[PDB]
């Protein structure tokens, strides 16, 4: 009934980390300061396990509130990918008759049909 010796003797098993140390979320929480292990683990899941990138993914639009309208800005539930950016190209055309293709086809068919058509 004295003190203990040899700490290598251990007592029993000591696993259950299954690729997922506290350094991942710890650091993450130290970089971003987020309290949503879910959105955090999301970043780690998107960065393929990389913290720096993940971080990037988050600091680059993490929480806030897009989708919905909120704020004063405009909502973004659709378009949001490449566009005239990656390339401005020529054939400039915005004013006058623009997108008249779908606007016209849509209008001609929208004028005869109900309103919303969703995916259809």
From Swiss-Prot:
Degraded upon nickel ion level or hypoxia exposure. The gene is USP28. Belongs to the peptidase C19 family. USP28 subfamily. There is a cross-link at residue 99 (Glycyl lysine isopeptide (Lys-Gly) (interchain with G-Cter in SUMO2)). Deubiquitinase involved in DNA damage response checkpoint and MYC proto-oncogene stability. Involved in DNA damage induced apoptosis by specifically deubiquitinating proteins of the DNA damage pathway such as CLSPN. Also involved in G2 DNA damage checkpoint, by deubiquitinating CLSPN, and preventing its degradation by the anaphase promoting complex/cyclosome (APC/C). In contrast, it does not deubiquitinate PLK1. This is Ubiquitin carboxyl-terminal hydrolase 28. Induction: Down-regulated upon hypoxia. Up-regulated by the transcription factor c-Jun/JUN in a KRAS-dependent manner in colorectal cancer (CRC) cells. It is found in: Nucleus, Nucleoplasm. The lineage of its organism: Eukaryota, Metazoa, Chordata, Craniata, Vertebrata. The modification Phosphoserine is found at residue 67. Residues 60-80 are annotated as: Disordered. Interacts with ZNF304. Interacts with PRKD1. Interacts with TP53BP1. Interacts with isoform 1 of FBXW7; following DNA damage, dissociates from FBXW7 leading to degradation of MYC. Residues 97-116 form the UIM domain. It comes from Homo sapiens.
């Amino acid at each position: 009934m004295t003190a203990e010796l040899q700490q290598d003797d251990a007592a029993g098993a000591a696993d259950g980390h299954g690729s997922s140390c506290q350094m991942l979320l710890n650091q993450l929480r130290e970089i971003t300061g987020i309290q949503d292990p879910s959105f955090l683990h999301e970043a780690l899941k998107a960065s393929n396990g990389d913290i720096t990138q993940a971080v990037s993914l988050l600091t680059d639009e993490r929480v806030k509130e897009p989708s919905q309208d909120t704020v004063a800005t405009e909502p973004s539930e659709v378009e949001g990918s490449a566009a005239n950016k990656e390339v401005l190209a020529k054939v400039i055309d915005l004013t006058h008759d623009n997108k008249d293709d779908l606007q016209a086809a849509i209008a001609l068919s929208l004028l005869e049909s109900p309103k919303i058509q969703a995916d259809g």
